[PDB]
């Protein structure tokens, strides 16, 4: 029974919703539960990073988001085999791996390759038994100053290049951008139909010439 003027609306309460209402009164108890669990995990893996492994440079999928770079799932096998880290040794020394990632580009692969080689220059790997080091172990001086780092290991930020104040060329001042966009729109929409009309013109051409 609506009155004079006001938005007509459809509240989704026609079901019996009072038997199922999730109330958030354990929000701070759940946060202190999670951070006590996080402190226990971070002190039970004692020199290792609390954030877990390292996760690669990854560009977001869709048109809204492809200019932003975020942390991905794991390093792909192709940048692992370029960085020389073995498939089953990467996650055991702390490098996350998913095999499902492709690498369709080259420069993102080389960014992940340089990021892995930076990680291997940065990590301090302890000998397995302390009384007997091996060839792939760090030196006992930097073993003394090893410690955890908080937050995500080598944080991933989308740094932007900065291009200086150019003096403008007259080719750029005679570039007609709106006509170029609409002309490319029209060519892309009409690519196929012009091709089949060229095909029909070719077949009537060979009919008129043969």
């Amino acid at each position: 029974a609506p009155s004079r003027n006001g938005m007509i609306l459809k509240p989704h309460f026609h079901k019996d919703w009072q038997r199922r209402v999730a109330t958030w009164f354990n929000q701070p108890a759940r946060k202190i539960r999670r951070r006590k669990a996080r402190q226990a995990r971070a002190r039970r893996i004692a020199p290792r990073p609390a954030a877990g492994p390292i996760r690669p440079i990854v560009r977001c999928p869709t048109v809204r988001y492809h200019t932003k770079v975020r942390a991905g799932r794991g390093f792909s096998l192709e940048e692992l085999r370029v960085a020389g880290i073995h498939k089953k040794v990467a996650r055991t020394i702390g490098i996350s791996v998913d095999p499902r990632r492709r690498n369709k580009s080259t420069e993102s692969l080389q960014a992940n390759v340089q990021r892995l080689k930076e990680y291997r220059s940065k990590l301090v790997l302890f000998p397995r038994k302390p009384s007997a080091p091996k060839k792939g172990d760090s030196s006992a001086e930097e073993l003394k100053l090893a410690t955890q780092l908080t937050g995500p290991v080598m944080p991933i930020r989308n740094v932007f290049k900065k291009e200086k104040a150019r003096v403008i060329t007259e080719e750029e001042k005679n570039f007609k951008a709106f006509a170029s966009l609409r002309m490319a729109r029209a060519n892309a929409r009409l690519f196929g139909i012009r091709a089949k009309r060229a095909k029909e013109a070719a077949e009537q051409d060979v009919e008129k010439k043969k």
């Binding site: 200019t67 932007f160 291009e163 200086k164 104040a165 150019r166 003096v167 403008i168």
Partner: peptide, 10 residues
Amino acid sequence: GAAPIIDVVR
């Protein structure tokens, strides 16, 4: 006559 670049996308 040098002109700044305004990169609106970033």
